[PDB]
Symmetry: D2
Subunit: 254 residues, 4 copies
């Protein structure tokens, strides 16, 4: 029951974004929501998508995580429009496509530092800024993948980028824990999102999950969302620095 | 909302038990509850505590998990008496005092196997019999300690038993996954229960947690129960074979 | 590595395909004196025949059924009398009933479960307590594990719970015996066609998977375990305790 | 016995370096060694460390790993001067102290990506260029710290770089496995080296080891070299993507 609660959701591109699953679940549970976006596709788009929700008013902010200025000013503006918040759902990453379908040993320095910047550092800077709006504490969640933990074929540079995120979570949880702010991750199983298009060896995973994972099925964005409701609410008080696998138990098998 | 849900809670001994933390939370949420005990002692207790709960009917069953008969015939009586359930909270462990204050290399064989019997194997037989009452699926949750992943001073044989329980949870997960039974653990941080009582200076991993955990506090039974409610309900739906730490972040640090 | 003037007790040779034998060949190649324990008479006969491949001028065989306190106690006492102090122990011993491996994991009998815990895990503890007595300046104790102790592996079942138990056992003994300069470590060998795999479903299909999916594209063998064991058992690993080395062509590190 | 073997060693600063402990071990075992340095300071130092060693006409090379070209041309010059190698020991990382002095949440973007650059990607590019000189296969090892796996107090942005490194080592292992190149990490305990010199959190942990690690002592650079020699040799064939902890058992307790 999330009435009276306010969350910022970052990383909705369209109806298939993991973050849209998050949105729908907190909306249903009565949370006030705030959204951020990178460009103008996610802009008109988002507006249309929020007609699916039950938000009295549309708080959207253009934040590109590569600018410190846009993250600092963006969160400050959110503060001025909606007051204090109770949490942030981080759902932002990027790797160059070429770096995923070539050999990991061939990853450019640019492609590598690029994926670090967007997929991992974003969360540090966003967490420093969002902290200003959480005086009595709150909850930050980020979205990761098992490739951060073990080497998965063709995940490559994004795997290194998610290992970095998952350690980010750990260091943020210990830094902000005394300020009563919890920092956790959701390691989601593979889902058919926009970024999932044209990635090498992706749709073979969906299949292998079906055959091998304890639950013999794949997950969906609404499943990630539910666990997100958990991590973002007081139900998870006491739980921080953690990584919850919403993945049909694929993580627990070899 | 867990109305129209029924859960079996194993291992309330008194007001301070971890399992009563779980009970309160789930009762609050409208669930029906079924309780099991070992001792006569823990029964007159169970009856008393029920007065603090919204349970119009006391359903209590004596099950000593050392007995195959008592576990088969107990779950069979639950099922006649109440019907299908939605899952099971397993909060049962034991080790001889004598072995935990000795050096781990001095542990008696009988001590070691008995801790294994009650703390790990009991979940396996419990799962197999509880599955009988879960035709459409459900969720099984066991309680562990960080001493099962890493060597914790003085936890000794119980750590080994907890390691075996975490593995057991993984194998059960993969076995009972195609039956839509999810199996998970909560790794509780230290708590002042009737069990903590004996261990000397147990007060000092207690103090250590205050000083060093990210949240700089110790967790409570109700915080366990809140995470339990997540795992036992449809909220945790894509999560199985997982070990969630309700220990204020203690596991993410060194 | 130079193991001359060093002495090691090797537990769990049963035939020429035993992982403990790949261990024995290598330590022998490096100049170590070796002492052997066996359970079945059939294994003692094997050991006799097998020395003939080794350069062990004196043949030391001891019957130790690790189910028995008395047998472990007396066995290690007799070893002290007969050969004196030792530099480490290789433990290469496990058991699980075949009924429990063919059933679903949920169906495992209590008896099978506890027998698996007793022999595959508890025996490292008693072994370490009595071995320690022969190591007053310290030494190195090594056990063998398998990845199904860390992740649920299909068909490995009760044994997986057993290896999980052993792997914690290694950590608690490392912590307990550290102050006595005794290091305790495990090797997670990849799957190897021993006498003990022979019966087992799931085995032939994991082997193939390793070849196909593990970073090195091949399966490992008993000598490779042996080599890593010489590192663990020697001063080459003087800083290493409570550690689990996967000798498995990198299959642990992928998904 | 690494007779007839050739190894490139990167990151000797002084006689207290970890990489020099490695060098002494490998030199004792009769291996050929190549050195790389950034600062001429470190060259001067190398030049005189050599008298301790039994190398005939030692080859020293400046490689600042922040530079693509110094690294390609560096290894290209090494294949020319001495031909094929059998291995690389990577002992290189950097983080600004002002990132480390502050709370982790205040970490500059710049300081994060530089850490990543120097401490993590430097491995990827090095691997790719050293592959060239290891046609029949070989062995690559790098140096991490337990702060890569867990949040260690004050380790801050380096913990995130080391996490990244650890992932890199795995993903290099899977891409490079088929070309018979093994890739591994050593997780060293704290040692008083040149780069330990300004750092907060160092005495704290160094003392906790003595009191808490199983061996109740801290480790030293030669103990690291011994494990380096194992992984860089045929003794560890079948071992890849692994992180060996040379830290008196500290990694294994909690
Ligand atoms: N799909 C899957 O199977 C899995 C996904 N994940 C993770 O979950 C998260 C959600 O991604 P997903 O829904 O899959 O796909 P999407 O492509 O829907 O969402 C990714 C979002 O990241 C945004 N983004 C990228 N770069 C920046 C930037 N510099 N500043 C701001 N926003 C940026 C994109 O914005 P824009 O579109 O405006 O360019 C987009 O909205 C990611 O972190 C992903 O790694 C984890 C496990 C598996
Ligand atoms: N206390 C703590 O700080 C922590 C505890 N844990 C774990 O939490 C769980 C509950 O612990 P906790 O509440 O602390 O202590 P409690 O003493 O409250 O609960 C232990 C329960 O185990 C029951 N039990 C013991 N042996 C048997 C048996 N043979 N058959 C049936 N039931 C049996 C006891 O019943 P009876 O009293 O009637 O014999 C009792 O109800 C255990 O798994 C424990 O290891 C995990 C992390 C930390
Ligand atoms: N084979 C594989 O693929 C892998 C094996 N392992 C592990 O490696 C170790 C060696 O297995 P492996 O060599 O493959 O098979 P083996 O059968 O060759 O060796 C197992 C040994 O255990 C002994 N043993 C069994 N019960 C007892 C007992 N009560 N007392 C004393 N010794 C006993 C057997 O001797 P006896 O017959 O005389 O009783 C035999 O020597 C085991 O720990 C196994 O779990 C780990 C990873 C993979
Ligand atoms: N000291 C410790 O307690 C521990 C150290 N480690 C790791 O061991 C490794 C070695 O460090 P350590 O021996 O402690 O101390 P050192 O200062 O002796 O070694 C660090 C080396 O990295 C080199 N280096 C730094 N930046 C660059 C660059 N831009 N290009 C090329 N080389 C560079 C330095 O060379 P130059 O001076 O010429 O710029 C220096 O030789 C590091 O990865 C460190 O994180 C791991 C665990 C604990
Ligand atoms: C944002 C982004 C970009 N720029 C490129 C590739 C992937 C992604 C997001 N994404 C999408 C799918 C995903 O699936 C994990 C399963 C896979 C395994 C190997 C390749 S994909 C993980 C994942 O992180
Ligand atoms: C059921 C039981 C029995 N019979 C004996 C000892 C312990 C327990 C339960 N318990 C109790 C306390 C606990 O504390 C975790 C912190 C500790 C570390 C070392 C000793 S206590 C963990 C834990 O598992
Ligand atoms: C000593 C013993 C007994 N008594 C019963 C089962 C297995 C073993 C030995 N063994 C043999 C093979 C092995 O292979 C690991 C690969 C597998 C995966 C699933 C089933 S086997 C591991 C392993 O432990
Ligand atoms: C190369 C570098 C730079 N530039 C800055 C800080 C540290 C280091 C190297 N280093 C040095 C010491 C060390 O000690 C680990 C123990 C600690 C724990 C918390 C703080 S230090 C680990 C470690 O990685």
């Amino acid at each position: 029951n999330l009435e009276n609660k306010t969350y910022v959701i970052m990383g909705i591109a369209n109806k298939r974004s993991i973050a849209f699953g998050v949105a729908k679940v907190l909306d249903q549970l009565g949370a006030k929501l705030v959204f951020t976006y990178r460009k103008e596709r996610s802009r008109k788009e988002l507006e249309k998508l929020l007609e699916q929700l039950n938000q009295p008013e549309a708080h959207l902010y253009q934040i590109d995580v590569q600018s410190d200025e846009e993250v600092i000013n963006g969160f400050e503006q959110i503060g001025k429009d909606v007051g204090n918040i109770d949490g942030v759902y981080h759902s932002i990453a990027f790797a160059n496509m070429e770096d995923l379908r070539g050999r990991f040993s061939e990853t450019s320095r640019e492609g590598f530092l690029l994926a670090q910047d967007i997929s991992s550092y974003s969360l540090t800077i966003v967490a420093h800024e969002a902290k200003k709006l959480m005086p009595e504490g709150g909850s930050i969640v980020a979205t990761t993948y098992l490739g951060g933990e073990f080497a998965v074929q063709n995940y490559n540079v994004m795997g290194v980028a998610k290992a970095s995120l998952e350690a980010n979570v750990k260091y943020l949880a210990l830094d902000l824990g005394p300020d009563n702010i919890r920092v956790n991750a959701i390691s989601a199983g593979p889902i058919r999102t926009l970024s999932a298009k044209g990635v090498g060896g992706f749709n073979t995973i969906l299949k292998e999950i079906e055959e091998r994972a304890p639950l013999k099925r794949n997950v969906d964005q609404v499943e990630v969302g539910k666990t997100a409701a958990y991590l973002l609410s007081d139900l998870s008080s006491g739980v921080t620095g953690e990584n919850i696998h919403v993945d049909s138990g694929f993580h627990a098998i070899k």
